[PDB]
């Protein structure tokens, strides 16, 4: 469903931007859903149908003679810049941010969620160009971690006086 501060990212971790939270996968894993990561198959064949080949994409059989196998985005997504994004985000550019879904209305619609420090700018097609502060909501319950701004996103990381599996 919708990722919150209480979502348990299976084989991933929580990140926060200006208008949403989402799970970020570990290693070279890919998203099978909003809160689950798995290994990515490298070649789609009859042995890898339905297995994940990317974020919100899995191998599927394509009809025809001869039949083929390819990495296709899940229902509700399409391939844009080699990544599966929601249909509502197809022609969307957010700037220093991401296009996410607003699902609060019967008609789902795409909005922008920005890197920490920016908010959508009504004077710039709602792109992530306006300065704005975002308070971090992450619960970094590990006794040695706190919320830090890493590469423009909020993320539980080692505190100001520790480094790297426990933060020590």
């Amino acid at each position, epitope marked *: 469903a919708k990722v919150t501060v209480d979502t348990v990212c299976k084989r991933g971790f929580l990140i926060q931007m200006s208008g949403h939270l989402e799970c970020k996968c570990e290693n070279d894993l890919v998203l099978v859903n909003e809160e689950t990561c798995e290994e990515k198959v490298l070649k789609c064949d009859e042995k890898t149908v339905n297995k994940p080949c990317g974020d919100f994409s899995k191998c599927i059989k394509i009809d025809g003679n001869p039949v083929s196998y390819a990495c296709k985005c899940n229902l509700g997504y*399409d391939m844009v810049n080699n990544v599966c994004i929601p*249909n*509502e*985000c*197809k*022609q*969307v550019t957010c700037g220093n941010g991401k*296009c996410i879904l607003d699902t*609060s*209305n*019967p*008609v*789902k*619609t*795409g*909005v922008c969620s920005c890197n920490i420090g920016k908010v959508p700018n*009504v*004077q710039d*097609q*709602n792109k992530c160009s306006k300065d704005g502060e975002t308070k971090c909501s992450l619960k970094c319950l590990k006794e040695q971690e706190t919320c830090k701004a890493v590469d423009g996103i909020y993320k539980c990381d080692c505190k100001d006086g520790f480094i790297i599996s426990i933060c020590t």
Partner: antibody
Amino acid sequence: VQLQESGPGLVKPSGTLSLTCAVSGGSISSSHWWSWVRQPPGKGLEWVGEISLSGSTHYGPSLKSRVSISLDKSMNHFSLRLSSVTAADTAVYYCARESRFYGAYFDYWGQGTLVTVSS
Amino acid sequence: DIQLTQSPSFLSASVGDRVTITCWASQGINSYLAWYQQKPGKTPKLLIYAASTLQSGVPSRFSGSGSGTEFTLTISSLQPEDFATYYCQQLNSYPCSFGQGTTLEIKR
């Protein structure tokens, strides 16, 4: 990206109105939703219907079971079909690309074509 | 369904005047209200979406405001080419609907 309607401009009463919207200068897959809008003479804009790239259709309830919309991804166009037409269907019909970015609206429109219902 | 009602139906203002069109929704649609400009017998042109977000290529004298069931379109300094019929539009839930239109005459 250019939108261009075409089709017969004169339909006899109870006949079938048939129009096609050809997309050029770009793919019809640039957006996932496409719509038809009409405007009877001197009246306001009316939403006729909508289709998605996956074939999902939604229609104006006023048109009941008389309206249908198809899409041909290979031909880069989509069509409108309205049956059992009366003079109340005389209107300029626009096709529009839908954008669903902070709402759901029509960012690209066609020239608009007039269809008069008369014998 | 969601009905949109615009006020006034007709409006006459002079070059340089500030004009405000009102669109009322029968039930709340958050800020997801769009505005169109249509010259007589011409293709409608998208001006504003999300109540107040100006579409690219639209002059800054156009602005919008509102949320819920009451919205406003404002032209801060009327220009001669600003005469048209203006329509609000929503598609927050099917079916899509328009206002009946506000016709703006340039007074001289």
